[PDB]
Amino acid sequence: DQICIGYHANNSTEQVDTIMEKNVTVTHAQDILEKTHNGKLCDLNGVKPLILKDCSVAGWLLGNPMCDEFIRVPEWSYIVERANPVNDLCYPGSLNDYEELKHLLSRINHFEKILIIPKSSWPNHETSLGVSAACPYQGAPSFFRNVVWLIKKNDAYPTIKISYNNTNREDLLILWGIHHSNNAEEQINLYKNPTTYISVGTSTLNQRLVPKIATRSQVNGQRGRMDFFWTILKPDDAIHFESNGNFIAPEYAYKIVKKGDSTIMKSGVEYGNCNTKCQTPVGAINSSMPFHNIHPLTIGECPKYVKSNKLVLATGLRNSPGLFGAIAGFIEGGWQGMVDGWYGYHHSNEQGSGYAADKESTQKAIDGVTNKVNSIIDKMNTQFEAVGREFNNLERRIENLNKKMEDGFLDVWTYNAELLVLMENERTLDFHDSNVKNLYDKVRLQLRDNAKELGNGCFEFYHKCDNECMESVRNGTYDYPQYSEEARLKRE
Amino acid sequence: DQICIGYHANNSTEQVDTIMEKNVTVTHAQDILEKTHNGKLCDLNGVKPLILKDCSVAGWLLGNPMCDEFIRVPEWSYIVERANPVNDLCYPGSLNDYEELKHLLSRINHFEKILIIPKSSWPNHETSLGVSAACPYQGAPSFFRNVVWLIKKNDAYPTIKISYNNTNREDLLILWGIHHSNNAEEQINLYKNPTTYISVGTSTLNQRLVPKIATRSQVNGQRGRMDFFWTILKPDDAIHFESNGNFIAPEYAYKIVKKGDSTIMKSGVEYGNCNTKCQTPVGAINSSMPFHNIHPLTIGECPKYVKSNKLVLATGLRNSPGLFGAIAGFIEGGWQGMVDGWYGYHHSNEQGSGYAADKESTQKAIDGVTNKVNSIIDKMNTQFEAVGREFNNLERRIENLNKKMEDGFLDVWTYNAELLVLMENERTLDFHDSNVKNLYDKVRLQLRDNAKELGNGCFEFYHKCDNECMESVRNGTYDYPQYSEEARLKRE
Amino acid sequence: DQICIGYHANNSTEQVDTIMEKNVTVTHAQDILEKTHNGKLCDLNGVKPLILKDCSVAGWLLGNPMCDEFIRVPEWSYIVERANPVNDLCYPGSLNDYEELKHLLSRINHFEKILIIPKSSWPNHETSLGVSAACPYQGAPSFFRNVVWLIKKNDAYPTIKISYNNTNREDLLILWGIHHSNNAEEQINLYKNPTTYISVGTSTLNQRLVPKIATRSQVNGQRGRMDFFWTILKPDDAIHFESNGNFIAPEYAYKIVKKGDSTIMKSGVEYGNCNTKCQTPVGAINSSMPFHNIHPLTIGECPKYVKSNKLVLATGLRNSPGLFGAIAGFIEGGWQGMVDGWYGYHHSNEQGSGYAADKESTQKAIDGVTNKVNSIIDKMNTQFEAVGREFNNLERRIENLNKKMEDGFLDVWTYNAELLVLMENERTLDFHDSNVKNLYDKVRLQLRDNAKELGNGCFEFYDNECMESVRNGTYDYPQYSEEARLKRE
Ligand SMILES: *[C@@H]1O[C@H](CO)[C@@H](O[C@@H]2O[C@H](CO)[C@@H](O)[C@H](O)[C@H]2NC(C)=O)[C@H](O)[C@H]1NC(C)=O
Ligand SMILES: *[C@@H]1O[C@H](CO)[C@@H](O)[C@H](O)[C@H]1NC(C)=O
Ligand SMILES: *[C@@H]1O[C@H](CO)[C@@H](O)[C@H](O)[C@H]1NC(C)=O
Ligand SMILES: *[C@@H]1O[C@H](CO)[C@@H](O)[C@H](O)[C@H]1NC(C)=O
Ligand SMILES: *[C@@H]1O[C@H](CO)[C@@H](O)[C@H](O)[C@H]1NC(C)=O
Ligand SMILES: *[C@@H]1O[C@H](CO)[C@@H](O)[C@H](O)[C@H]1NC(C)=O
Ligand SMILES: *[C@@H]1O[C@H](CO)[C@@H](O)[C@H](O)[C@H]1NC(C)=O
Ligand SMILES: *[C@@H]1O[C@H](CO)[C@@H](O)[C@H](O)[C@H]1NC(C)=O
Ligand SMILES: *[C@@H]1O[C@H](CO)[C@@H](O)[C@H](O)[C@H]1NC(C)=O
C-alpha cells in the first residue's frame, strides 16, 4: 500500500534549447517564429498594389509612352518596382530630387491627374514637333505624355510668360524640364534664340535654369539630355514660368488625393490573385505568430522580423523516454498513464491502482507558464520596424549609414529574442522541478511517520490506506491520528 | 515548548511585477521612475535661458526690427524657440544652411555682436534707403538691423571692394545677402547696373552670387526675394567682398565668446522664475530617480528617459494578507508582529512569548538587495541620449532616418529597463524564499530529535527551553547534549 | 566511520561579479576580454597596407610632388592616413565629393594608373609652364603630376575638344580641375581668352565650369584656387572635354582592378613587418577572446568591441578562504585536499582515509558550464561593427547622427555583455550549490537510519568496497541495519 508523486509524459518530440542544454524534449511547447510565405504578391486588406512592371516611378509620373497602362491608376496599397525597370526616362536626362519624391510617394495612396496647362495655351509656339526617336510609340517617335516639348514656330520663339493657380484644395505635384541641346546649330533649329533660360517661381521656389550646350555621350540614341524638376504647389499658390527656349512645359499634374501608409517595394515576384494582411518583397505572410524571419521590409499588420532559424518556447515539462532534484532526479521518469494533468499521484492499494492529477498544483503552473508566454510576447510589441529608403550614387555614406542602422537594430533585437527564450526556458523547466518537489513535500508533511520514504517519490504506508484514505492524501485532509496506532505497531 | 520560523508582514499595498505574475504586493519596494514635472521653463544652474518668444533664430541673428529685444542678449543656458515663430524673415527669402547654423548654435552659449563695417565705409552708395514695408518698425518701413541694403547713389552703383580681417582672436559669424529684383526696371531703379554679381572670398570660401530676376508669388507683400548666407571667419582670416549691385552688406557680426553645452528647445510653455538641474520642453525635473518618462529631449544632469508608465523594483518580500517551499508554502503567512527584520523567530515557553528577528540573515538579504538595486542603476548609467536635430523640406529621408534611429534606441533601452526589473523582481522574491528556508533548516539541524517538526515552520520542544535556551537557538549555540536525555524521556 | 559531502577549494585569487555580490573569489573562471595589442601596423592575411605617410588621399590621387611618387602601388589590405596629413593639396583648392570618393576607395583594393591623355595631344597649348611655387619639387616650382595645367601658347588659347573612350572593361576614375584666377590681367597673361568655361560630358555627367575670378585670402602663398572634380567612367563610355581656358586637364587615370573590403585608417603608429587577422589604429590583436576593448574601428576577423575594463565568466565554485543551502551553508567549507573534481566525498574507514570525486556529478557540471560559456561566446558574433565615415564642415548634423548611432550601439552591446556575465555568473554559483545539495540528498536517502545525519555534510555509518558502492549508488539497507539499533544506546 503506497502512494507516489509523479509528473506528466506524452509522445511529444518537440525540443527547446536552454543556456546549459540544447535539444531538450518537452511535453508541451510553443513556437514563436513564423517561417513560411506564399511566395506571391497579394492585395493588402482588399486593396490591390500598384505593380509598375518594367516602368519606373519617373516613367510613370513623367508619362513614358511605354507606360500608358498607368494613366488612370486606381488607389494603391503599395507600389511594386523591379530593381532595374527598363522603361525609365526614354529621353536621357534626370529627375531632380528623385529619391525625395519617392519618399513623398511612400506616404501617398492615390493621385488624380489633372490638365493644368492645355496645348491650346501655346498659340505662338509649336506643340506637335517635340518628339524624339528615343521615346518611340507604335513605330513613330513620341515623347513624355504629361509634359510638352515646345519648339519654335514660324522661325520664332517668343518669351513665354505663364502662371497656374492651384484653385484645388489638394496639394499639386507639378513636373517640368529643361532641354540641353548639343550644338549652336541645333539650338537655332529648335529655338531660334541662341542664349536661353528658364525661370520658375512660387512662394518658395526661385529657380533659374540655363541649358548646357556641350558634347555628351550617346544614350538611347541621343547625345542631348533633359533635366526634369518637380515641386508641390500648395493650395491658393501659383507657379510662374518664363522661358525663351529649351523649356519642357508641364501639361498634366498630379493631385495628391489620398495620403496614408504605403511603400515602394523592390520585387520581381508575381501577383497571385490573393489577399493578405502582411506583405514582404518575397511573399505574403499569414500567421498569428509573434515573429517571422521572411524579410526585414514588411507592410501591414505583421509579426516582428528576426534573423533566427528556430525560436520555440518551453511551456511543459522535460519529457521522459535539475536545480531542485525532483524531475529526472529522485523521480527518475514521467508517467504516460497520467493524462489529466502535469503533476499528480499514483496510488496502489488492495482495491486497485490508478493515476490522479493534482489540479491545484497543475493549474497554478498553467497560469504561470501562460503569463510568462504572454509577458514575453508583449515585451516584444515595440521592436525596430525596417523601412525602405532610397539613395543615389553620390549618397553612399548615407546609404551605408542607413544599412548599418537597420542591420544593427536587427542584431540587437534578434539577440534579445533568442536570449530571452533561452533564459526563460531554463526557468520554466526548473519551475516544473519546484512544483514537483513542493508536491512531494506537501504529501510528506501530511503522512509524517505513518509512511516510509522510499526515495523514488513513493510513500509506503505503514498502515492500510484504502481508496477513501488515498483521496484524503490528495485532498489535503489526511488524518494522521486515525492511523497512527497501526503504523506504530507495523514498525518492527 | 515551541519556537517558530517566520517572515515579515506589514500594511504595504505596493505592487511589483514579475514575468510569471503581475500586481504582486510586497512589503518593501523602490520606485525608480520619475513621472512629475513643474510644467515651466527654468534656469539651468543659475543661468536663464534665451527665450526668443515669436522670433526665430534667423530673425534674431539677421535683426528683424520686430526682434529688437535681442540685440544685446546675455549668456544663456539653452535657447527656447516656438514651433512656428511669427516674426522670422520679414522680407521674404531664405537663410542658407539654416539647420547647419542651428547645429552650431547648440554648442554656443554667448555671442558678442560687434560692428565690423560701418555705414561710413560706403561713401559712394546710399545706405539709408534700403528699407521695405515688409519689415515695418513703428509704422515705417525698415529692414534687418545687422545688414545694410545698399542701393545706387546719384544714379550710379560703382563696384564695391571691401575686406575685413578678424583681429578679435575668436571665431566670428558673418551674415550677408543678395536681393532678387522682379524686373529690369526695378533692377535699374535700385542698382543702375543691369547685370550684377556678388563675390565673397575667404581662405576656404569662394562664392559667386548672381541675382535671379524673375516673377514670383507675393509673400509678406513682396514678390522679390532675399537670400542670406553665413560663414565662420576664423581669427586672422579675412573676408573679401565684391559686388556691383543687389549686395546686402554685413554691418554687425557675432563674436563667439563662450562655447559649451546648450540646445535649441522647441516649447510653448512659459518661464516660471525657477532654477533647476534638468529641463525638458514640457517642464523641469527635480528628482533623484534614475529614470523618467517626461520627454526624450532634456538638457542638464537628468534621469535616463524611458517610455514606461511604471517601473518598480521589489526590495522586500511578498506581503501577506514560490520556487522554494517556504514563503506561502509550509509557512502559511508572515508575522505582522515581527517589525525588527525580514526573517526571525517566535518563541513560546513558560516565561512568555516574543517576536525576534535574525540579524545575520536579515542583514545578508539587505546587503544583496541593496547591491542589486545599485547594480541595476549602474548598468543604465550609459544610455542613449536624444538630441534635437533639424532638417529642411528636401531632407525628409535623413529626417526620417534620424527619427527611426532615436526612436529605435528608446525602444531598446526601454525594453532593457522593464525586462531587467521584471526578471530581478522574480529573483528577489525567491531570494527571500530561500533565506527563510535556509533559516528554518539552520534551526532544524541544531535541534534534531530534541524537538518535533510541526511542519508549519514551528518546532515543538520535547524538553524545557527557557529564555536563554531560546536565545541559544537564535544564537546558533544550542547544546544538544545538555537536553538529549529529557527529550528522550518525553518521547514515549 | 563516516563519509562526507564536500566541494572543491583551491588557491585561486580569480574574481567574478554578480548582480547581488561583487568581487566574489571563485575556484575556476574564464576571462572573455582581450586587453592587449602589439602596437604595430601589420599585414592583414598576408596583404601589406597602403601607408600614405604624410600625405592625404587627394594628394596621392592627384599627384602632389612632395608626396611619394606612388607608382605601381601594389594591392593593399587597408589604407593608412595620418589624422591631419601635412601635404594634401599643395595648391589651394578643393576636391568635389572628397568624402564620397574616400567611401569608394574604402571598397577598393587595387588601383592601376594608366595614361589616358598624352601631353602630345596639346600641340597648340603650352604643357610645361603650368608650375607653381606652392607645389615644389627639388626646390623648384612644379605641380600635380597626374594632371596638366595648360597655359596659352603664342598669346593664344584655342578651344579644346578632346574625348577618351574607356575600352578597358574595368571602371575608370578620372580627375580634372579648374583654375580660379585672381585678376582679369592674370587671366589674359595665362589664357588670353577673357571669358572661359569648361564643359565635361559623359553618359551620366553634364558639367559646366566657369571660373570665379575674385579676391581671396592667400593660402600657401597663393590667392588662386584649384578646384578638382572626379567621375567614374564605366566601360565602353567616353568622357568629352571642352574648354577655352582655366582647364587642368587629366593626364593619368586610375583603373579599378579589385574591389573588396578595406578601410581608411587614421593612425600614426609604425609598420612592424607582421601579419594579423585583426588590426586596430592602436595596434594588432591576436586573440580567441570573444570581446576586446582596444579600439572600436577594426578590420578583419576581430573580437567584438566593448567599453568594459573587466569581463570574467565564473566557471567554478565560490572559493573557500546561496539559494540552496549547501555551499557556504550546512557544508561550511571546501576541501583543498580534493583535487580530482568539483564535488565528491571523503571517507574514513578501516583501510584508511581517502578523498574521492563523483565523476558523474562533476561531468554534468562541466558539460553544462562549458555549454553556457560557448552559448555566451556565440549569440555575440552578430553585433555592431563600426565603419569610418567622413563628413565636411557643413555636414555636421549628419556627422553627429553617425557618432550618436555608433556610440549608441556600442553602449547597447556593452550593456548586453556585462549584464549577461553578471546574471549567468550568479546562476552558475547556484548551479554548483544545487549540484552539491542533490548529491547530499542522494546519499541521504540511501543510508537512511544506517547513519547519523551530523549536519555538517557528514554521515556517521554504524569498507573500501562498500564506500565505493555508496558512491556508485548501491547499498543494501538490510545488510547493515541490525547493528544500528544496538549502536543506538
Ligand atoms: C491664386 O488665387 C487665389 C484666390 O483667388 C489668391 O488668393 C487670394 O484669394 C482672395 C479671394 O478673396 C483674393 O481676393 C486675393 O486677392 C488673393 N490672394 C492673397 C491675399 O494672397 C491667390 O493669391 C492666388 N495665388 C498667387 C500665388 O497668386
Ligand atoms: C501522439 O499521440 C496522438 C494521439 O494521442 C497521435 O494523434 C499522434 O499521432 C502521436 N504523435 C507522434 C509523434 O507519435
Ligand atoms: C539538435 O537537433 C538538430 C536537428 O533537429 C541537429 O541538427 C543538431 O545537431 C542537434 N544539436 C545537439 C547539440 O544535439
Ligand atoms: C475529499 O474532497 C471532497 C470535496 O472536494 C469531499 O467531499 C470528500 O469528503 C473528501 N474525501 C476524503 C476521503 O477526504
Ligand atoms: C501603514 O503603517 C504605517 C506605519 O505608521 C503608516 O505610516 C501608514 O499610514 C499605514 N497605512 C495604512 C493604509 O494604514
Ligand atoms: C493591477 O493594478 C492596477 C491598478 O489598480 C490595475 O489597473 C490593473 O487592472 C491590475 N492588473 C491585474 C492583472 O490585475
Ligand atoms: C590679418 O591681420 C594680421 C596682422 O595684421 C595679418 O598677419 C594677417 O595676414 C591678416 N589676415 C589676412 C587674411 O590677410
Ligand atoms: C576587487 O578587487 C580588486 C583587486 O584587489 C580591487 O582593485 C577592487 O577595488 C575590488 N572591488 C571592490 C568593489 O571592492
Ligand atoms: C568606345 O568604343 C567601342 C568600340 O567601338 C564603341 O562601341 C563605343 O560606342 C565607344 N564608346 C562611346 C561613348 O562612343
Side-chain angles (χ1 to χ4, degrees), chain A residues 468-469 471-472 475 477:
Chain A
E468 286 188 325
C469 166
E471 166 79 352
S472 60
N475 255 0
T477 70

Side-chain angles (χ1 to χ4, degrees), chain B residues 97 99-100 103-104 107 199 201-208 230 237-240 242 324 367-369 371-372 375 379-380 382-385 387 389-392 395 398 401-402 405 409 412-413 416 420 423-424 427 430-431 434 438 441 445 448, chain C residues 18-22 180 211-219 223 225 227 307 322-325 330 392-398 400-402 404-409 411-412 414-416 418-419 422-423 426-427 430 437 444 452-456:
Chain B
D97 293 342
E99 292 74 17
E100 283 293 314
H103 191 266
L104 255 76
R107 284 112 188 91
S199 313
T202 81
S203 55
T204 74
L205 189 68
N206 188 68
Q207 178 179 96
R208 195 170 204 265
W230 63 270
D237 193 37
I239 181 150
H240 304 261
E242 180 163 330
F324 308 87
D367 293 11
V369 160
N371 289 357
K372 160 174 294 193
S375 294
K379 296 294 105 145
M380 317 298 243
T382 77
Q383 266 209 8
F384 184 69
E385 259 145 355
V387 57
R389 287 180 277 248
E390 271 137 341
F391 302 102
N392 64 62
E395 312 185 306
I398 271 285
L401 194 151
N402 175 74
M405 189 263 288
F409 275 111
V412 155
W413 280 110
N416 290 355
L420 189 45
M423 264 156 53
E424 295 313 69
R427 291 219 130 220
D430 304 324
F431 178 62
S434 99
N438 296 339
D441 275 13
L445 292 209
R448 290 160 53 180
Chain C
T18 79
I19 273 167
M20 253 174 272
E21 211 177 335
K22 255 63 182 179
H180 297 281
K212 294 176 202 165
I213 322 193
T215 302
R216 295 161 280 264
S217 315
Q218 92 175 346
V219 183
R223 273 171 223 265
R225 297 294 114 93
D227 282 356
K307 297 174 101 263
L323 274 178
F324 311 88
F330 65 86
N392 59 51
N393 329 288
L394 281 168
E395 278 172 329
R396 292 242 180 89
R397 291 169 302 145
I398 284 323
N400 190 252
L401 200 157
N402 191 56
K404 261 48 180 82
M405 197 222 51
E406 299 207 318
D407 261 294
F409 277 126
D411 289 347
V412 160
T414 283
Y415 166 86
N416 284 352
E418 303 178 329
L419 184 78
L422 281 167
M423 271 189 315
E426 186 208 78
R427 257 192 101 72
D430 298 324
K437 194 227 204 333
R444 206 266 317 280
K452 195 219 243 178
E453 287 156 26
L454 296 188
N456 62 339

